[PDB]
PDB file of C-alpha atoms and ligand atoms in Angstrom:
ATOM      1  CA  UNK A   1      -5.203 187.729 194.879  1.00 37.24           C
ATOM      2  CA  UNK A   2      -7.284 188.533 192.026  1.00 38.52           C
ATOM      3  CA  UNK A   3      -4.284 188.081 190.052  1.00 35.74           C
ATOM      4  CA  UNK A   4      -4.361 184.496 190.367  1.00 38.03           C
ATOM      5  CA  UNK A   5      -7.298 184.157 189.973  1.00 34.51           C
ATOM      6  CA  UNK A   6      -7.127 185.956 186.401  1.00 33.18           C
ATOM      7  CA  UNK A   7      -3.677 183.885 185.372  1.00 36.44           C
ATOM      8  CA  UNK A   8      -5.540 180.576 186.291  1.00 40.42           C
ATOM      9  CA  UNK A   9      -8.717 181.801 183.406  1.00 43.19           C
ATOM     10  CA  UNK A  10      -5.497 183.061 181.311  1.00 44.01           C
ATOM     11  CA  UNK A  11      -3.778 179.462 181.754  1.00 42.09           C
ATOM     12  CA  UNK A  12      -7.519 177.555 181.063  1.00 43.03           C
ATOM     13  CA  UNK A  13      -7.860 179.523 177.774  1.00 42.71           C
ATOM     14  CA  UNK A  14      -3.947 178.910 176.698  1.00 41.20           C
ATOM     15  CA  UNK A  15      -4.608 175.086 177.523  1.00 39.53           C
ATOM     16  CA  UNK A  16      -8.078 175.204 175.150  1.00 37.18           C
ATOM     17  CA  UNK A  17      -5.865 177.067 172.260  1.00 38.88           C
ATOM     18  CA  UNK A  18      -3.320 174.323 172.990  1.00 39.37           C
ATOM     19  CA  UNK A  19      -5.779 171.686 172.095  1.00 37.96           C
ATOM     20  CA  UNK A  20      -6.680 173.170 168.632  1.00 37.06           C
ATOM     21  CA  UNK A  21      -3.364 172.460 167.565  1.00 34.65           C
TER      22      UNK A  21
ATOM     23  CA  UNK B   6     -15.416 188.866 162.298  1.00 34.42           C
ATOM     24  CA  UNK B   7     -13.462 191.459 163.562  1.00 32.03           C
ATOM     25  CA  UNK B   8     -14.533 190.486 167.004  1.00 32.89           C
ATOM     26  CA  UNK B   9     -13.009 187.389 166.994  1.00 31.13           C
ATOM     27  CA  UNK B  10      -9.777 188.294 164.701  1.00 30.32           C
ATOM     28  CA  UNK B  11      -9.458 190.971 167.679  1.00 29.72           C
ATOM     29  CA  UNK B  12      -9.699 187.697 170.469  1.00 31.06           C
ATOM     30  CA  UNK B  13      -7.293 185.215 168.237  1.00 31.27           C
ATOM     31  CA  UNK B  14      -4.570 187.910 167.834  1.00 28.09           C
ATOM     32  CA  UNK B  15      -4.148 188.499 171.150  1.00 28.09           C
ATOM     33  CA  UNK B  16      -4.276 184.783 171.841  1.00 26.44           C
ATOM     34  CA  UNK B  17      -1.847 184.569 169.129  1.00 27.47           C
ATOM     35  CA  UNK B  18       0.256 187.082 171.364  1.00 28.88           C
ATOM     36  CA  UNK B  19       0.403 184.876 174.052  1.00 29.11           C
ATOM     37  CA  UNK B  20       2.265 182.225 172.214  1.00 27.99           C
ATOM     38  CA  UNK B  21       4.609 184.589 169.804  1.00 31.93           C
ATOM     39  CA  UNK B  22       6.834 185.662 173.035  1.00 31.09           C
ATOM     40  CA  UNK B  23       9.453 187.147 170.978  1.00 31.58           C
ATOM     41  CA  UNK B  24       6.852 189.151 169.154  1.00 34.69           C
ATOM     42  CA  UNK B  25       8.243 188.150 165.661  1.00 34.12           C
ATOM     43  CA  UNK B  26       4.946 187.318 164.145  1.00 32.18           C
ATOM     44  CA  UNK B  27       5.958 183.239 164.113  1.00 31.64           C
ATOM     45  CA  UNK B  28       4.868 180.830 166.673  1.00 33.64           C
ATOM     46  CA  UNK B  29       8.197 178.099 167.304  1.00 33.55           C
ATOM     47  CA  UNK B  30       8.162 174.848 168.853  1.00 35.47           C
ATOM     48  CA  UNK B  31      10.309 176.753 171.251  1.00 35.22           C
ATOM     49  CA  UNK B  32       7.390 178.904 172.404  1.00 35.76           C
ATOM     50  CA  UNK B  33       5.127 176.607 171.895  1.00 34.86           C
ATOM     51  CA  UNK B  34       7.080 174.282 174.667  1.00 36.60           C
ATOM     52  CA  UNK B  35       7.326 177.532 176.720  1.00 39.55           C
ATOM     53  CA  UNK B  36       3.609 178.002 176.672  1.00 39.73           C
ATOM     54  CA  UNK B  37       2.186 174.056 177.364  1.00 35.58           C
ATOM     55  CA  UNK B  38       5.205 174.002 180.271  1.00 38.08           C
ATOM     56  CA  UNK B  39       3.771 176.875 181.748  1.00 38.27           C
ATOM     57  CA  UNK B  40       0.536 175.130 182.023  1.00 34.47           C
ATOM     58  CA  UNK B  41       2.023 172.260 183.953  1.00 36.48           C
ATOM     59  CA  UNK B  42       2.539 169.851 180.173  1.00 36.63           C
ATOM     60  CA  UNK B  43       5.437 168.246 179.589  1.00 40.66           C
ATOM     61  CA  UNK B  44       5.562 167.965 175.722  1.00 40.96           C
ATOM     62  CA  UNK B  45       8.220 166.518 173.763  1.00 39.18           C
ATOM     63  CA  UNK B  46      10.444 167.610 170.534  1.00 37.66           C
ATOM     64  CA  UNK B  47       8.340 165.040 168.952  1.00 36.07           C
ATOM     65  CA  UNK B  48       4.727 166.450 170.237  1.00 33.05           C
ATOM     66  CA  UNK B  49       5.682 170.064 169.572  1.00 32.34           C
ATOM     67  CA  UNK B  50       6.963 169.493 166.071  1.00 33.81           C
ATOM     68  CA  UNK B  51       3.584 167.240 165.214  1.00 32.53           C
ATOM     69  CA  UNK B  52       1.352 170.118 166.918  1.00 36.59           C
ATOM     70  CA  UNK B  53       3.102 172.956 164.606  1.00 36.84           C
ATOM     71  CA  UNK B  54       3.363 170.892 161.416  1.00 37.83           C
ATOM     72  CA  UNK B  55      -0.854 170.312 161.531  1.00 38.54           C
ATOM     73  CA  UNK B  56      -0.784 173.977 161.885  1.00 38.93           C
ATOM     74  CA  UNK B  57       1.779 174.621 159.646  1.00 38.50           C
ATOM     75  CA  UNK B  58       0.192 175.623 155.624  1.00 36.10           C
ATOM     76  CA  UNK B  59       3.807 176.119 153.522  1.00 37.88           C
ATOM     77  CA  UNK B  60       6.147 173.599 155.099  1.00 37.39           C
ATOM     78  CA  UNK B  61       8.448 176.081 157.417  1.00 38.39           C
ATOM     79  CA  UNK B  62       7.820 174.604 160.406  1.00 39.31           C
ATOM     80  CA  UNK B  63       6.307 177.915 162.147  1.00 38.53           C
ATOM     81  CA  UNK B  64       3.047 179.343 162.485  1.00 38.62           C
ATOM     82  CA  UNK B  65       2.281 182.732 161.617  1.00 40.43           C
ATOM     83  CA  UNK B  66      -0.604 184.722 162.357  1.00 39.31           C
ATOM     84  CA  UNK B  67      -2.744 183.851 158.884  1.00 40.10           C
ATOM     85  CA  UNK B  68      -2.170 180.177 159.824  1.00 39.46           C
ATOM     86  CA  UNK B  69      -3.254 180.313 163.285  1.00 39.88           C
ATOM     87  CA  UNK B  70      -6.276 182.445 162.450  1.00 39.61           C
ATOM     88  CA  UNK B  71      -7.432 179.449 160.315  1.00 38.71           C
ATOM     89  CA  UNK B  72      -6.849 176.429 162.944  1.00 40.24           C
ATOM     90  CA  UNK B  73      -8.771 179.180 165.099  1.00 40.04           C
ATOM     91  CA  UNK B  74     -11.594 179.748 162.421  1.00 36.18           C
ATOM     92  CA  UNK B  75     -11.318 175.241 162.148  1.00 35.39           C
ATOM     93  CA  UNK B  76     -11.694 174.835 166.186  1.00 31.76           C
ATOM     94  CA  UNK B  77     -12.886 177.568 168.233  1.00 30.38           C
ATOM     95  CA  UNK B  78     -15.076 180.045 166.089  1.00 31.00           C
ATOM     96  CA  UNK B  79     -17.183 180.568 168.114  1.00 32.85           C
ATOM     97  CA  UNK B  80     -14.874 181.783 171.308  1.00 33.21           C
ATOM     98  CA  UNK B  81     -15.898 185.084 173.365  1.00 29.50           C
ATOM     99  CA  UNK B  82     -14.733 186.439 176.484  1.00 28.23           C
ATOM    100  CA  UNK B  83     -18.087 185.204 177.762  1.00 29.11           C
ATOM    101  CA  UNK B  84     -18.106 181.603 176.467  1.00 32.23           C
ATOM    102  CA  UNK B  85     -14.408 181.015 177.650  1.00 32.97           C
ATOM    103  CA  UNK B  86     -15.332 181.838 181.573  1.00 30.88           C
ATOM    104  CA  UNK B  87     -18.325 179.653 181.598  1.00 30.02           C
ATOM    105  CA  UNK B  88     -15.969 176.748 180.166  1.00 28.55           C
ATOM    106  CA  UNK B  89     -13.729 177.329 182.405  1.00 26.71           C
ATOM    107  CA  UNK B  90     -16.216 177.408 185.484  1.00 27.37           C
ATOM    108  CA  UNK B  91     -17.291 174.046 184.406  1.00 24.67           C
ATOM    109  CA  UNK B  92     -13.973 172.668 184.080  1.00 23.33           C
ATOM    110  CA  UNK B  93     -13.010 174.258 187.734  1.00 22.77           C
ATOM    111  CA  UNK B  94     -16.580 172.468 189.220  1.00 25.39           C
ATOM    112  CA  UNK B  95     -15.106 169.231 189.220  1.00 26.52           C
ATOM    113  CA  UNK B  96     -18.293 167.653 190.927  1.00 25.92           C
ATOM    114  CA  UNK B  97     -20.855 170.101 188.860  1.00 26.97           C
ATOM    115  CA  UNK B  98     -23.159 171.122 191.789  1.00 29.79           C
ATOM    116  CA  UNK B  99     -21.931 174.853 190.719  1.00 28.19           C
ATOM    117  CA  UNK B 100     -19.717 176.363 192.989  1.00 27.10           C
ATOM    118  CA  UNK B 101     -15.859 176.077 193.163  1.00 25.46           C
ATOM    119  CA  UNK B 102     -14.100 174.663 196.406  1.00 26.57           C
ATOM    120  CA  UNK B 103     -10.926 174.845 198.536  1.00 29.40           C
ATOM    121  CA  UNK B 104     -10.449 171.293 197.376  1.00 32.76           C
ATOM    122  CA  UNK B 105     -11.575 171.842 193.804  1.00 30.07           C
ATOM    123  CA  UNK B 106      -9.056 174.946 193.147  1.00 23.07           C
ATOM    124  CA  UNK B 107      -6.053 173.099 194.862  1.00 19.99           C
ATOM    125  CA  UNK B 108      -7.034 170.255 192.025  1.00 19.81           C
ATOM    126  CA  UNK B 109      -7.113 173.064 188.565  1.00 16.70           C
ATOM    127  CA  UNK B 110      -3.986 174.899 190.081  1.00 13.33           C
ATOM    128  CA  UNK B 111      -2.125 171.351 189.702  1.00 15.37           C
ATOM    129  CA  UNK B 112      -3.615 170.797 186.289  1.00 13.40           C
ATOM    130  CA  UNK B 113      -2.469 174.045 185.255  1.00 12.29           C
ATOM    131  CA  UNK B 114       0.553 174.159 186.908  1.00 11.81           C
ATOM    132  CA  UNK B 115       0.047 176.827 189.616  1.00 12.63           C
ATOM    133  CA  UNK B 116       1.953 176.680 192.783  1.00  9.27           C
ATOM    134  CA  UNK B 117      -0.245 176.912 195.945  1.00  9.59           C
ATOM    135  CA  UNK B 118      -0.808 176.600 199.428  1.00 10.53           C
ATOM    136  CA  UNK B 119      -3.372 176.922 201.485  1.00 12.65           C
ATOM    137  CA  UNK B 120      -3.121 179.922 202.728  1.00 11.25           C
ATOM    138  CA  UNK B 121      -3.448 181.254 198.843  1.00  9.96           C
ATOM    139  CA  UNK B 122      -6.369 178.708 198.461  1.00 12.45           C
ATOM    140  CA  UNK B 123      -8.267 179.911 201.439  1.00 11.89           C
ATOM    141  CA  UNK B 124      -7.521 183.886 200.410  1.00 11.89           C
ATOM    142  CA  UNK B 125      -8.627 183.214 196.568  1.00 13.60           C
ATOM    143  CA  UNK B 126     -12.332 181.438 197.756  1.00 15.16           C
ATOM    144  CA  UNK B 127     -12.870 184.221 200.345  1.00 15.56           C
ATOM    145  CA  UNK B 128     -12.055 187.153 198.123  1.00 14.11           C
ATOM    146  CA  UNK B 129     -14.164 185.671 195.354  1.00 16.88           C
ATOM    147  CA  UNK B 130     -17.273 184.825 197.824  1.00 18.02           C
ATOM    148  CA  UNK B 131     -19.606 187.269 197.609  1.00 14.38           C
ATOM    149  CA  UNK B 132     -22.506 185.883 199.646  1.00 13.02           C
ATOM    150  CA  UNK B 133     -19.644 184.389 202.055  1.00 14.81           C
ATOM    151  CA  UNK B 134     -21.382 180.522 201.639  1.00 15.63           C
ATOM    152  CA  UNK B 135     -17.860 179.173 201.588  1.00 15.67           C
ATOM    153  CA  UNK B 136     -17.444 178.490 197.696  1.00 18.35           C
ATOM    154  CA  UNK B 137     -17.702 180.152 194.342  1.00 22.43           C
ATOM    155  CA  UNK B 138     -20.635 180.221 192.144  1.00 25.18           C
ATOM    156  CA  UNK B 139     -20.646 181.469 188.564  1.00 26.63           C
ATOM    157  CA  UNK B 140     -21.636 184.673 189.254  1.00 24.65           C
ATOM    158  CA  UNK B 141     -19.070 185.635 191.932  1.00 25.15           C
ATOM    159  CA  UNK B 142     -16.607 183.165 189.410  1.00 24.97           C
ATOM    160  CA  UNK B 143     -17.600 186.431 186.243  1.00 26.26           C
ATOM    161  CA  UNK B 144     -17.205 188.724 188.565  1.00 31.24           C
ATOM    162  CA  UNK B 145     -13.620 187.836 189.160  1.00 30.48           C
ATOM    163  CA  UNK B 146     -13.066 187.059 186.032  1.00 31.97           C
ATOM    164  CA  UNK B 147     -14.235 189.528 183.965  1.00 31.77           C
ATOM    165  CA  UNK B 148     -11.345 192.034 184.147  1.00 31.83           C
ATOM    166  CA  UNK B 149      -8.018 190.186 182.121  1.00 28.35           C
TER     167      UNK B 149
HETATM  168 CA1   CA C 201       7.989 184.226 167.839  1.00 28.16          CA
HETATM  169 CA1   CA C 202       4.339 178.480 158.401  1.00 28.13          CA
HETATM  170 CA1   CA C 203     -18.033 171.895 192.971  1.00 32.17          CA
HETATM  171 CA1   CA C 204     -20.373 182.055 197.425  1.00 31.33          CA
END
């Protein structure tokens, strides 16, 4: 589902904005 | 620029879930278990208080703009998918696998199975070679 797909890039940049802190 | 003050709010808006205007080591725990983390009191409260410019152990939107403006300046909607395809390509010969997907829905704590696996790499493979290259990746991933 194209969904996923989109929550998985969603996820990836929440884990990168993670990292800044 | 406004571009990017536009792309860190609404980052910013994933993390304030209450919509207060404050990121708490509450939603900040919400956020990194979502992605499969497993953080400490201890981590969370570290993680806000280097973010954290007058001591009140929250971060509001004028101190996350400046870790932002610190660490990830640069950021588009472009330059975030082609990170991310390179972190999905575990082996780097550019294209994303069954076996490679299975491994970034772990690390990002996704349930799967295989059935999802197998739908996800056909509906993203355009030129039906089995995996997914960067192009077919932006294509699925352009839309939010
Ligand atoms: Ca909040
Ligand atoms: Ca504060
Ligand atoms: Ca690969
Ligand atoms: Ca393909």
């Amino acid at each position: 589902k194209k969904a996923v797909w989109h929550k998985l890039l969603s996820k990836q940049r929440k884990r990168a904005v993670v990292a800044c802190f | 620029t406004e571009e990017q003050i536009a792309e860190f709010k609404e980052a910013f808006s994933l993390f304030d879930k209450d919509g207060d205007g404050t990121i708490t080591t509450k939603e900040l725990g919400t956020v990194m278990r979502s992605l499969g983390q497993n953080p400490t009191e201890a981590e969370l409260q570290d993680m806000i208080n280097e973010v954290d410019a007058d001591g009140n152990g929250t971060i509001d939107f004028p101190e996350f703009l400046t870790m932002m403006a610190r660490k990830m300046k640069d950021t588009d909607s472009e330059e975030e998918i082609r990170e991310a395809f390179r972190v999905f390509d575990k082996d780097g010969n550019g294209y994303i696998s069954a076996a490679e997907l299975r491994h970034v829905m772990t690390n990002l704590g996704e349930k799967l199975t295989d059935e999802e696996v197998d739908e996800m790499i056909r509906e993203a493979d355009i030129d039906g070679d089995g995996q997914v290259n960067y192009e077919e990746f932006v294509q699925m991933m352009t839309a939010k």
